[PDB]
Design a protein around this ligand. Structure first.
Ligand code: A1BS0
Ligand code: ZN
Length: 139
């Protein structure tokens, strides 16, 4: 679990979106595992606008933040699950690090701000859905 709050927006994993998120939908993309919904309050998270490949992520399954080197956003094959069939997920960044299913939503941050959220994992790897290209989150 975990979301990003920026202005009148709530950014969550699409596979964890609530009824409220769907009834207040702004944008969703299954291929990126993202869903953005509207909020009545003003979000204060800053989105990074950069091409950093190092940062820190929050891991709920260890209650700890971990420093990571992560790849550039790209199409990565993700195995079938209760939420999606086996497919390529786009805008995905991989790092070597611990993750478990309940970890989805934890924020990845660099010195410039919020980079993306935990979305995949398996075998000592963690995958982050990038949000830096979503320039409309600030306007
Ligand atoms: C942190 S997720 C994790 C971690 C360790 C092991 C297994 C997982 C589950 C995982 O990778 N997925 C299930 C939820 C939907 C994800 C997707 N974006 O398609 C894929
Ligand atoms: Zn950065």
């Amino acid at each position: 679990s975990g979301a990003i709050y920026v202005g009148n927006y709530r950014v969550v994993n699409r596979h964890l979106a609530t009824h409220n998120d769907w009834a207040n939908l702004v944008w969703e993309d299954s291929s990126r595992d993202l869903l953005v919904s509207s909020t009545t309050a003003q979000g204060c998270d800053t989105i990074a606008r950069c091409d950093c490949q190092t940062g820190v992520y929050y891991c709920s399954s260890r209650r700890k933040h971990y420093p990571v080197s992560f790849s550039k956003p790209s199409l990565i094959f993700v195995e079938a699950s209760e939420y999606y069939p086996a497919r390529y997920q786009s805008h995905l960044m991989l790092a070597v690090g611990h993750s478990e299913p309940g970890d989805c939503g934890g924020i990845l941050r660099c010195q410039h701000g919020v980079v993306g959220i935990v979305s995949t994992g398996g075998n000592g790897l963690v995958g982050f859905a990038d949000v830096r290209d979503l320039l409309w989150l600030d306007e």
